């Protein structure tokens, strides 16, 4: 009945304590901390208790203990972009943003491809994409799918291109 990181207490449904209620085993996660600006391995029990307690500076990177690589690197780029996202969809341990679909069968945030982006009323950005001298206007979903693809681009300013 109770949500992730929570525990039943006297008909209430309160958060868990990371240092008291996680003496059992749980799978290792790789997590990032905005304050210290370092990532580290953490038990899933402690991480979910922290997110119940609104530790917004703590972000999910990937399942298992930390391994450097592109997937870890992209996890750090997600965190810097997450302030620009209006969707904050819970998805397993992760939180999916405007440029991602929650894959329910795997509990993984999966980056959309650019043509899947619903423009709607998303915030626009003027950008230049590498090896070119022609500005283009992109919304935040589009920008996120491009960074996820590891594609060369530079943002120039918020809002549509003035040209």
């Amino acid at each position, epitope marked *: 009945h109770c949500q992730l990181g929570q525990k039943q207490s006297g008909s209430e449904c309160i958060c868990m304590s990371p240092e008291e209620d996680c003496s059992h085993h749980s799978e290792d996660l790789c997590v990032f901390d905005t304050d210290s600006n370092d990532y580290f391995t953490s038990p899933a029990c402690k991480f979910l208790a922290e997110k119940c307690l609104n530790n917004q500076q703590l972000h999910f990177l*990937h399942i298992g203990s930390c391994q450097d*690589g*592109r*997937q870890l690197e*992209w996890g750090l780029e997600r965190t810097r972009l997450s302030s620009a996202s209006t969707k904050k969809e819970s998805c397993g341990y992760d939180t999916c943003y405007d440029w991602e*679909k929650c*894959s*329910a*069968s*795997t509990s*993984k945030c*999966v*980056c*959309l*491809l*650019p*043509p*899947q*982006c*619903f*423009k*709607g009323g998303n915030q626009l950005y003027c950008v230049k994409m590498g090896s070119s001298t022609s500005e*283009k*206007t992109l919304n935040i979903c589009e920008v996120g799918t491009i960074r*996820c693809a*590891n594609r060369k681009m530079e943002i120039l300013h918020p809002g549509k291109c003035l040209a």
Partner: antibody
Framework: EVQLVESDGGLVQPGGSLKLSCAAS????????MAWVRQGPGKGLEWVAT????????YYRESVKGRFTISRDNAKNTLYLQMNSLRAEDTATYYC???????????WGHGTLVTVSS | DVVLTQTPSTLSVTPGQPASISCRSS???????????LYWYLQKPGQSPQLLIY???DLGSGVPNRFSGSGSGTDFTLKISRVEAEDVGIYYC?????????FGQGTNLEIKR
């Protein structure tokens, strides 16, 4: 209900021209990319072109470049495919498609038959 | 161009029985961030294709849950647990992991009687 209705296909002699149209309703047309997909007599499926929201960016299958042009008119809620220098291997049923957050080709029209023949 | 080669090209299934269709890719569809853009479509006779499975194993909207997908890398599989008459048609796999987008040649599903 999302709805896509292709038309302006039909018979065209080889080397002739055709401009397909696809009328969209049931959603905000200018909020989405659009694509054309075709199915030849062998019943294989083949992506043709994609267009971004306002037509400032277009993408094309390599066998089609320099011959087809994807365009749109968001005031009329219509997707187009100009097709020049038509070959017999372009004979197919052409569908317009709209993506979703699940897939690239989520919603499909019923298609318009293009027959290239003398 | 990534070539998707489906197997079998035809299969006959009694209603109520399960069915399995495989899709072999000439190149791995897993990318360097852990995502795999494989999809399954059904084209019933006289109709346009409709989505069944997205991202290997996620079920499309309005699709019955007797359809499932699985696999990784280059080998992927669609499964129908209990076939019904309305599932007759041609089943296609599609990849969007490497441009241009490509489909499989299709697998015909016959109702065995």
């Amino acid at each position: 209900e999302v709805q896509l209705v292709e038309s302006d296909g039909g018979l065209v002699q080889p080397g002739g021209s055709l401009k397909l149209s696809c009328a969209a309703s049931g959603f905000t047309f200018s909020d989405y990319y659009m694509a054309w997909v075709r199915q030849g007599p062998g019943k294989g499926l083949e992506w043709v072109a994609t267009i971004n929201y306002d037509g400032s960016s277009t993408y094309y299958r390599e066998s089609v470049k320099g011959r087809f042009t994807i365009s749109r008119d968001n005031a009329k809620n219509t997707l187009y495919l100009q097709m020049n220098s038509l070959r017999a291997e372009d004979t197919a049923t052409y569908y317009c498609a709209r993506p979703s957050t699940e897939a690239l080709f989520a919603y499909w029209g019923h298609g318009t038959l293009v027959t290239v023949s003398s | 161009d990534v070539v998707l080669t489906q197997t079998p090209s035809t299969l006959s299934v009694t209603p109520g029985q399960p069915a399995s269709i495989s899709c072999r890719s000439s190149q791995s569809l897993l990318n360097d961030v852990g995502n795999t853009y494989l999809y399954w479509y059904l084209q019933k006779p006289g109709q346009s294709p409709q989505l069944l499975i997205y991202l290997v194993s996620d079920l499309g909207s309005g699709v019955p849950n007797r359809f499932s997908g699985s696999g990784s890398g280059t080998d992927f599989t669609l499964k129908i647990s209990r076939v019904e008459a309305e599932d007759v048609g041609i089943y296609y796999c599609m990849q969007a992991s490497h441009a241009p987008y490509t489909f499989g040649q299709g697998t015909n599903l016959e109702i065995k009687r």
